Amino acid sequence: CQDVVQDVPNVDVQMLELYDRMSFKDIDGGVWKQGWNIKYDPLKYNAHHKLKVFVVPHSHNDPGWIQTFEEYYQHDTKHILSNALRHLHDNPEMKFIWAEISYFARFYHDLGENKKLQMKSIVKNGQLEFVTGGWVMPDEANSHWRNVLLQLTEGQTWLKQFMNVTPTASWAIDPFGHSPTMPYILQKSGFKNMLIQRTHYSVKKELAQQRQLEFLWRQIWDNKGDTALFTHMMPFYSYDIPHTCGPDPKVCCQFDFKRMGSFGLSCPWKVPPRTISDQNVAARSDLLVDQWKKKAELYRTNVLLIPLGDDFRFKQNTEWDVQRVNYERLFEHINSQAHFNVQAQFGTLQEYFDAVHQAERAGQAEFPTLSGDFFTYADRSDNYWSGYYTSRPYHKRMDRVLMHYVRAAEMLSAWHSWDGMARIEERLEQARRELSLFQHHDGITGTAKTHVVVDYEQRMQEALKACQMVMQQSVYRLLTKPSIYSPDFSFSYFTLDDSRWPGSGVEDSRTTIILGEDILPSKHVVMHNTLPHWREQLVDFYVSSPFVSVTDLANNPVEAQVSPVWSWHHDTLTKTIHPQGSTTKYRIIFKARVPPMGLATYVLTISDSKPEHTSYASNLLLRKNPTSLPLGQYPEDVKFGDPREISLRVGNGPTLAFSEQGLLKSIQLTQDSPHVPVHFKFLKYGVRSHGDRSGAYLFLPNGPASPVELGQPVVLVTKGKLESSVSVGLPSVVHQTIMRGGAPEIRNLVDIGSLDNTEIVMRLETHIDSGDIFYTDLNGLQFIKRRRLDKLPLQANYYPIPSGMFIEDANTRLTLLTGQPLGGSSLASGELEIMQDRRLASDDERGLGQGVLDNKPVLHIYRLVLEKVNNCVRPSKLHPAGYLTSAAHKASQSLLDPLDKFIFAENEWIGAQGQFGGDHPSAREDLDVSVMRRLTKSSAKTQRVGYVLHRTNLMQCGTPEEHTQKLDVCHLLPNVARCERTTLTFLQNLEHLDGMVAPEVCPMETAAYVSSHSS
């Protein structure tokens, strides 16, 4: 294994280093507005060294943006694909690249057989080429690496099955900035090349100047370079035709033959295209070749990539003709005029890369190495695209919920082969596809029109219901005596209970377990643990009586705590935000202990009075002017008092002190220790009254944030043996700090209401001497060092926080883990901040044509880990990565992949069993089985099950922490006959494994394995 901590990679371009050196001046470069006037030597190209030009036709098709997926499919994409098929069939020389498999699959399945065959033939013959081959072209900022993989696999599995092709070149022209998570996954999925486009205009200028726009992109910790993937960054402002022929868009626009008038398009530079004729072809070619030779100066080989396309292009037959015929006249002239020394033709993306690497092998060029990312993007001036790190945060949180439910459904159902009538494969395919669709760069980003957001939400809701059905059928099969098991595949044996989605105050969607002497004495509940190690976690359920006790399936008592059910109400009469208690529903909380990738059953039983092993929380309501708060049978009366500072400690864990407004002020780790200042504060950013306005994409604050005026908020303290909390009703946020004996959990019920032109931020203020350094993650995969740059505006110092961020000095670290992607930063030493929601009246002029006014209540979740790090073995000051500790990593897992809870729906579960998976290996804590997926249907003689294994890297801080077991995924199911290492999509076998044993992976590595079973 490579050491990912102690060896700083030597690379030609390291993006943090480059950022520190660059000036970011936005000067007028002339016709290339963000560059300079490119010069070339006409003698560079000659009869023995020609410029090879590949014109690559393409059409960018968003799976939802202004229209829904289906609306675009009906109005545009089905015609584009139908006309591509006809035109490429009839014109053997014409080429076209296609990216979005969600659309292609929808189209292909609707084709008659004769046309399916024609389509297969133009792909087989190389005219139509798939690039990337994912279900979508995903966002790279907010997406979790697990879901980027899921959608890539969904599209490529479809392509292998129906087209018989697996792309090895990736095309990502539209995500708003770029992540090294992409080359990481692609390179482990058989890819050899990738292309990107939306990077900061200053970065394009800088790399262009050094001919570093093509580079071998390796991971920031990779000293050897085995993660490296060849990457091509396009040089200009857009991928449209005006910005792809060369530096001068007034010229390139004249070579977009759809812009002459009849298609309702024109050139903003006020010079139109003209149809190519024998009388103008020479002068037109003079102009175009000069653009091409200018572009070619920015690159190292004699092979030039010229994309030819734009959004939803190549729709009309007459459009295919006008582009093809005019380009063909140009090619015939140029290629026959030796003085140009150019050979130009239509080509595909792969053809481009193959010729580039042929030039490389001939010794004509060597490429620089690069590590780092390409956030935060700005396309011009101070317009930084950090708003979409937060836009539509309800659906951002929904993404992470569905992410986990898809994993749990695939894993629970993977243990068995299912009859087709169970509709398991059907429901799993729907769930994967709707989650995969939402990875689109207008889905999770929150940059789609309101009605499209609705469509993505409805699709995800159906996906959640699909996952629940599969999960609950799987639990029933796994925990029922086989000779008793009698499934109705349409029946609901269990319902899922989820405490944090949609979350209390977002939906009264939690079912109460109804017990009573005259109806039902007891209820079975089951917990699933998708992680491959034993896990204990507190779980809660609503019950109809406070007098409930818990047993395990050996009838051993389990310690439990009952608390009231509190709901917060904005009282339009008294103009206060205050909590109400239920007088008929209560919460019971107990510690569940669940095997690795396993299940554990418990029983809740009512009694007529307080049970021996159940305790009751106290409750203290702090406000002036209190009124009574009855709680039915709950055995402890609520107490009242004026607002005051309070301190809490659960178990032997930290002691937390809170201000009289209910906000954290300090954390004391142990009995002896300092009360370390750690202050939560809520603030608001506004919008500029003159100049550019914030919108779905752009964050353009009118200065630093101002504190939210809190008034005198109502504070509720619940103190229990197992769980305590402080909750406060602030304007727009019910803010909750929950303590279970370790790092607290924070929950914010965020309802920005009708506060127009407002962004609500949650800030942590500490005295940690972090200076200008902080760390944020990329796609939940890795943590990258950030440096706050005062030479850039505030919004440029915002980065994606897809799952966590931290600051540290020599002694102390504070880590905030998230259950949803949001934007954030550290705008001053000792600070962390993360945006909660944003409501914007204005559009930001990128084409969406609306502001963001469709906010809805969202429950954001966090864990907050304050730790001593003076003993941790950390990377050197020059290393671009950072790494979590064990506690911070486990805290992240508790948010992203909590225990699943199932409530038995009927009165009696006959043949019920107490546990599944007690014999599963309990793997080392840094190892995860990210995916478990059965790959075969029940009719296959040879069953195959796929596993993705990911090992993170955790800091060595002096904890001996050992005693675990080797996890060999290939032996998890019986009767193994073969074990293969595969690409991460499972589509190609890479290694036939000795003894049928899947080795564990190295820190920061991910591998896939497929086990084959004869049973």
Ligand SMILES: *[C@@H]1O[C@H](CO)[C@@H](O)[C@H](O)[C@H]1NC(C)=O
């Ligand atoms: C699928 O592609 C491979 C590539 O070598 C080819 O050998 C095989 O015959 C193809 N199967 C078909 C034509 O369906």
Ligand SMILES: CS[C@@H]1[C@@H](N)[C@@H](O)[C@@H](O)[C@H]1O
């Ligand atoms: C950023 S403009 C971009 C458009 N190019 C469109 O494809 C959609 O993705 C929108 O967000």
Ligand SMILES: [Zn+2]
């Ligand atoms: Zn797009």
